[PDB]
């Protein structure tokens, strides 16, 4: 419908006012002589929010050029046309809404964070890796950098401590992944266990350059997990070489998956299976040897496919993306395909750049209420890139470390009773991944809306 599909490139939008003129006159909600313009307004916001989500109300105002009272009406007024809801929500930015503010929105998350509320981490990240085999140009592993073996024993046993702490009313709230490498930890296996025990049911983000037969043997609690995640660093040799420093890296991790894809099928198990691929500047035609991958791991699943696979960026992007997404329903037609925040607005053409927080943008608070990672040695990390060792100045994004005396909830409370506030000084942006930054800028927009007296409204959709 055309006041549905109104935020993307090149959309009708004559056909959309006319849509939602026609609704609002149908409603009783506008005299009909009026409604054609306040319907021009509606389709303004929708285009907007649509495109830009964080966009501050009184910035919106102020490029309608309307009233403050003439706001509040529109404003309400949008409420009253689900069609617009729809345009904002399925619009290039509708990564953002649908994916991350929405249910978080929804499930009060946003709420807690922004009354500044002792509430326990909405997402929890157990980073239970002592190492990585990999050499990637910019982590501490590019040193020695990694944990000492002899802080295993005891980080097991914190992080089950941990896993004993999480509310009920969301399995999936907990999830294992890195700084460092998971597998890496020989007790991950007996953790996710412990998690299945418990009611969770977690994800692993890894490499998967260890997800081996012998690995499994060793550790059988990972075929409990909901999900594997698989980093994927390139899809050759050569390709892996370049961004891992190992060598043979590819047909290792590839063969490590089409075994693990036989014994999954052997085994009739439930677990999922997912991949995460960067697309590179100018190497969007990848895109199509990634199908290829996974439809010869779909091959050896003797019927057990691929499940998801999550892409980001970071010649024609869109028309890459367009072949890509034809050449998954041919071949793989049952991968589910999630796109990052910026190529889920590139699908239709519309510019699209990443968010780029900085200090100035950073909230001194951070989001424990959101997010928190807890690393092997207790210290639970305010941001998801802040959890490496030895990396330089990520120990004062640490808001307290879980251990015999001190829990999770603990930590997490004590942090946020006393205020605690982390200054930003220059380099801190990059402790925070994508979801950090997407937090801190909703964050940011709620504050600004409730500050400039739209503390309802706040946020334009929730
Ligand atoms: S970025 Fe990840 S995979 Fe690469 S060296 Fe660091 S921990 Fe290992």
Not at 64 to 81: K, T
Not at 396 to 408: C, Q
Request: aromatic content about 8%; proline content about 6%.
């Amino acid at each position: 419908a055309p006041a549905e599909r109104c935020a993307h490139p090149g959309a009708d939008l004559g056909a959309a006012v006319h849509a939602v003129g026609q609704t609002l006159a149908a409603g009783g909600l506008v005299p009909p002589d009026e409604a054609g313009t306040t319907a021009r307004h509606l389709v303004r916001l929708a285009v907007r929010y649509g495109n830009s989500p964080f966009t501050p109300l009184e910035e919106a105002r102020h490029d309608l050029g309307v009233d403050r009272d003439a706001f509040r009406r529109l404003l309400a007024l949008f409420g009253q046309v689900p069609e617009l809801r729809t345009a904002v929500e399925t619009g290039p930015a509708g990564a953002y809404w649908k994916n991350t503010l929405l249910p978080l929105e929804q499930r009060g998350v946003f709420d807690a964070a922004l009354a500044r509320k002792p509430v326990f981490p909405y997402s929890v990240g157990l980073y239970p890796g002592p190492t990585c085999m990999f050499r990637c140009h910019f982590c501490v592993r590019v040193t020695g950098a990694r944990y000492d073996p002899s802080a295993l024993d005891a980080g097991n046993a914190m992080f089950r401590s941990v896993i004993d702490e999480i509310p009920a009313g969301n399995p999936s709230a907990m999830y294992f992944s890195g700084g460092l490498e998971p597998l890496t930890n020989p007790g991950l296996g007996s953790l996710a266990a412990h998690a299945t025990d418990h009611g969770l049911r977690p994800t692993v983000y890894t490499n998967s350059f260890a997800l081996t037969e012998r690995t499994l043997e060793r550790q059988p609690g990972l075929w409990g997990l909901h999900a594997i995640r698989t980093s994927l660093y390139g899809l050759n040799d050569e390709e892996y070489e370049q961004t891992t420093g190992k060598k043979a890296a590819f047909r290792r991790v590839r063969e490590n998956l089409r075994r693990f894809q036989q014994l999954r099928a052997e085994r009739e198990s439930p677990i999922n299976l997912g991949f995460a691929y960067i697309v590179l500047p100018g190497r969007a035609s990848r895109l199509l040897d990634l199908v290829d991958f996974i439809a010869d791991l779909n091959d050896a699943g003797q019927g057990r496919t691929i499940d998801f696979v999550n892409i980001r960026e970071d010649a024609e992007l869109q028309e890459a993306l367009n072949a890509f997404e034809e050449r998954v329903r041919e071949r793989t037609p049952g991968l589910h395909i999630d796109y990052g925040y910026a190529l889920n607005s590139l699908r239709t053409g519309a510019d699209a750049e990443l968010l780029r927080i900085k200090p100035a943008t950073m909230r001194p608070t951070a989001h424990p209420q959101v997010a928190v990672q807890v690393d092997l040695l207790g210290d639970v990390y305010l941001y998801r890139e802040a959890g490496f060792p030895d990396l330089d100045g990520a120990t004062r994004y640490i808001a307290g470390r879980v251990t015999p005396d001190t829990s999770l909830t603990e930590v997490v409370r004590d942090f946020v009773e006393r205020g605690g506030e982390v200054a930003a000084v220059d380099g801190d942006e990059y402790f925070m991944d994508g979801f950090d930054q997407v937090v801190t800028a909703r964050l940011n927009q709620l504050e600004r809306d409730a500050a400039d007296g739209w503390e309802e409204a706040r946020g334009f959709l929730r």
